[PDB]
Amino acid sequence: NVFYATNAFTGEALPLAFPVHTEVEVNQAATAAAKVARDFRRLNNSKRASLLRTIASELEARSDDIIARAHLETALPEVRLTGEIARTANQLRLFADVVNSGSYHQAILDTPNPTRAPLPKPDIRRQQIALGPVAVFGASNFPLAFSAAGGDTASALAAGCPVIVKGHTAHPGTSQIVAECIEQALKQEQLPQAIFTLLQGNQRALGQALVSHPEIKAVGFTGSVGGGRALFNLAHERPEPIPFYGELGAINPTFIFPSAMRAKADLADQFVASMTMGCGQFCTKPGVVFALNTPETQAFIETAQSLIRQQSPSTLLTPGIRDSYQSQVVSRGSDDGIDVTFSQAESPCVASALFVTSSENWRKHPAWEEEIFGPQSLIVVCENVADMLSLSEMLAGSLTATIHATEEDYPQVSQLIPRLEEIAGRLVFNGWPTGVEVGYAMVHGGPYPASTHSASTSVGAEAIHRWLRPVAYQALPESLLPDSLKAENPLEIARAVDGKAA
Amino acid sequence: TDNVFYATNAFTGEALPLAFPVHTEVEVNQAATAAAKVARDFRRLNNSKRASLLRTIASELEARSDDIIARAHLETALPEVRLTGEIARTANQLRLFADVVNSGSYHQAILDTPNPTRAPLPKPDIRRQQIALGPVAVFGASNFPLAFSAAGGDTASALAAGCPVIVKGHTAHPGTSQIVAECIEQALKQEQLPQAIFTLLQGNQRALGQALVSHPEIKAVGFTGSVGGGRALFNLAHERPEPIPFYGELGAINPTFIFPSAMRAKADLADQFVASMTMGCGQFCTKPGVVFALNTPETQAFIETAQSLIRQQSPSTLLTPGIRDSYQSQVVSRGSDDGIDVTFSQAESPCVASALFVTSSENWRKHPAWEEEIFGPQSLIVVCENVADMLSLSEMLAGSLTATIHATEEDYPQVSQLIPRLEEIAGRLVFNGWPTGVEVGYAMVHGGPYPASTHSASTSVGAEAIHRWLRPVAYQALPESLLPDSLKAENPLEIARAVDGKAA
């Protein structure tokens, strides 16, 4: 059995057939991955770092092919795709630096004390090592940076874990080219092909078997709350439960104070640009804005409403995503106590939408907190700041939380931050949540449903730690200790001794 | 409460004085609600203040040491000499986390230096730190009524992280937990902090623990106990509308590999083995439950020496009637199997006999039910055909807290093939020593692959245990005045911070 990718612009099948893999290929892939797991995590840091950089170069070399195919499969602009390939490549290079530095080892040493009474203090040293093969499900809205060679794959390979990707049916051709790049990189580095494997197929039994395979030791997922939670449950029902890192969705609450409105005349313009970026197909898209019932807000709303009406027709990633959006916006727009403004569009294109309501009705409709993936957003007009702070106390988990204010509001903002810290992974001040910097301090995730594991990040240097577990070595002789823990520190890595700074 | 219950005298099986309440979902809700109410203030306290609280709890514990020891002894049958040492362990454990919190290292401050003139788009100012998850539920261990219970490692590390704690008191030692709770109550009063920071719930109705694990205000769980109950509670924790981290240590048999040269080098190795497996009457989670050795004369002698020592062991009194009944029932069943020899010490119920089983790697491969742990003064020796056989066996070992190797330089070539295999199944590897002792320091890893732990990427003992109760938050473009002290440009707390990848 085979299947074809769908032309995002026409809804018709694109050339090139892809295989429909099943539990048979899963078993084969997982078995081979397990077979090379030990050697892969034992490679010199410099070697695995080299592999990551080689993958980055190979990807750049096929940029032409990737962009051309991804554009037809997703309808994302070639310029957006060109920027994403660069993000993807530099992301891989970041982890190459991380691995090379040996920081991920997190070497910790307890200085022994043989003359301690009653009992002597033993020599104990610990480091982090790879969990084993990792299964990765890529994101449909970021076919490159969050997919086949995305953040989850890059950080897992960096940690020393073989990777098996369940290719997203929304962009099989894109993933195939990326897989060919990784295949080339492994050949040049002269490393086992089983280090990375791409599986394809439009039958869900595939993903379920992968998540349930006993040789799979962790999962990386980016997608819907429905499918994500289903797979998460599968992962924890296994004879041996495994970590499941899934980003399921968020509404990214934004709080705008009057003074911020007075300070930036184009704030409404910025808002619309943020919510319509990539036709609103960003997980960090500001889905709800809380503002006060003042003239500034009423003007903000009218400006935003006017821009929305003016907005051009949008083509979503797939006809399927197109359908869910249309039915949900028309459906919500008919709910109690909600005003909606639509742009002009005819299927297969969708219209952008801006909903407006009061905090009274927001409290009455908890379903409005659920994300509607597409170029739509909601504005909630609050009675006063107390009303606004009250609302923040009940917010569900989110990737981000944004605040627009000036010094005049700091007294109230100082009370709001502690509440937002509890529900979001990243707080943004006087800016928009859309952009996600791939650096060292990033936290892309947060409380459920933003992530199934709030104590982690799927983007940034710290993402590597999701695929590692510690091992303590007690009283082992120097010759038997891994290089990272040898007394002389031959790798010259950062290590923490008796609590001192590493 | 509608009902009360009594603790059981570990030596007589009769009820001890003092009745304890049987809490239900009602007290769970009250406790969790109150804990949630003080969670924010608790995590925002100055590091020095929360550090002081931990030290005050340690002092209060020491002040009631005589009462704790006297009660714990009757409730558990553990020697007072052992309990006196555990109180010190408990107190110094709290002081360790006091040092951790005070140092501000747990914040794990990380900063990305901004670059406003970067093209196409500028690089924003991003800073991140770890903050408390919120209220934490703790289930204490029956075999370590002090260091792994009410004021044990999970409670200590959680309070250190800034999380309120609700302990579901173990029914095996309610009186011990009560005294410990009174100590924490005193410490909170002295520090002038909310009582809701710590709450002890008691009761012998399982509905209690299940309601606690499922309460929406509870944000994480610490558990030390059986795989049956532990896995059940773990599943509950992940079926919640909002799944929460569950850190449970469920069991292990701590595989030990002994090479011929090691037995030659230490004539008393068998003696050491027996001492390790019978320590605390074998009621250690790190007890060496299975020893793999080669089919050589040294091994036969080792076995005969161990067997002789086992025959002379003093009758043992276990922790609870259930652990007792479970031990007796399980050792007799296994001994009746074919292909396995068992040696018992002399004992009459309720006391139990120590036991040493012996079998071949073939029969071990034929009876997978033998890898199942049996909590008590019992252990198994598996005689292997050769080193290759030994290595083949290590490849199929279940997760364990520890893995031990006894060898000399002679064996290093084979030991180097074995370590990589053991790294994959154990949280801590011990060389030429025994797994029983667990050093409370900075490098410890007490846990490991399932079932040793439900979250292999963590430790329940050691300074790093604090990270189980924390989650990161990134702050982007916030002004200095709105940022937490740990992330302020001037670093007013003078804590270790990592900038642009540099070493903290």
Ligand SMILES: NC(=O)c1ccc[n+]([C@@H]2O[C@H](COP(=O)([O-])OP(=O)(O)OC[C@H]3O[C@@H](n4cnc5c(N)ncnc54)[C@H](OP(=O)(O)O)[C@@H]3O)[C@@H](O)[C@H]2O)c1
């Ligand atoms: N918050 C985040 O970080 C974020 C960002 C990006 C993506 N997502 C979300 O993803 C949604 C866009 O739809 P999507 O197509 O990317 O999501 P999706 O339907 O959840 O699909 C994601 C992947 O999981 C697979 N899958 C889903 N449920 C599964 C199950 N129960 N059994 C087996 N496989 C399963 C899909 O297989 P098929 O290939 O068969 O569909 C696909 O490969 C939006 O809501 C977007 O916000 C989350």
Ligand SMILES: NC(=O)c1ccc[n+]([C@@H]2O[C@H](COP(=O)([O-])OP(=O)(O)OC[C@H]3O[C@@H](n4cnc5c(N)ncnc54)[C@H](OP(=O)(O)O)[C@@H]3O)[C@@H](O)[C@H]2O)c1
């Ligand atoms: N790996 C380590 O770090 C470590 C250290 C020490 C102890 N342990 C393990 O602890 C075990 C000792 O057995 P145990 O009898 O003390 O353990 P247990 O039966 O698992 O009980 C532990 C606690 O969990 C509660 N509990 C268990 N089942 C529950 C359920 N399904 N619903 C609600 N509450 C539940 C018990 O309540 P009741 O009080 O009502 O029974 C008790 O307070 C041994 O297997 C030992 O290896 C592990």
